[PDB]
Design a binder for this molecule. Structure first.
Ligand code: MG
Length: 70
RNA sequence: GUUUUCGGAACUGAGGCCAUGAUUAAGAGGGACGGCCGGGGGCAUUCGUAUUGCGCCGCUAGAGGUGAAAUUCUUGGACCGG
């Protein structure tokens, strides 16, 4: 703060809410995050976009690295 | 001449009497009816998410699959979310 124009006009006490569609199946992990509606997504990261081993895509190691980028 | 009811055999109508004549109701069966009961059967009827595909929309570089990988789908926006 300021950003500036990105993000809505907010106060100190209150906060803006989003939704994280965490599709953590086997063989991969998705930490998709969107607006409160669900359709205007903000940041989409998956486990495979970080690990290059093609087998750890659902491993816990890939899982939190993707989430922190979100 | 025979009369032969005569001997017996023939059919038919009105009677009495017979305690007048039907064992039982199977921890057999069949039925009947009463209140139910049951993912029993058939015909229609309605609902549910899911899957697949589609049309938009935002979004981005991988997605899928495997013990690992690959065939495969991917800037024609794949996968994801509405
Ligand atoms: Mg693949």
């Amino acid at each position: 703060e300021q950003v500036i124009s990105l993000g809505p006009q907010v106060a100190e006490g209150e906060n803006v809410f989003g939704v994280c569609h965490i599709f953590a199946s086997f063989n991969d992990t998705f930490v998709h995050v969107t607006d409160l509606s669900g359709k205007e997504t903000i940041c989409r990261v998956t486990g495979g976009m970080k690990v290059k081993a093609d087998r750890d895509e659902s491993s816990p190691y890939a899982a939190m690295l993707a989430a922190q980028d979100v």
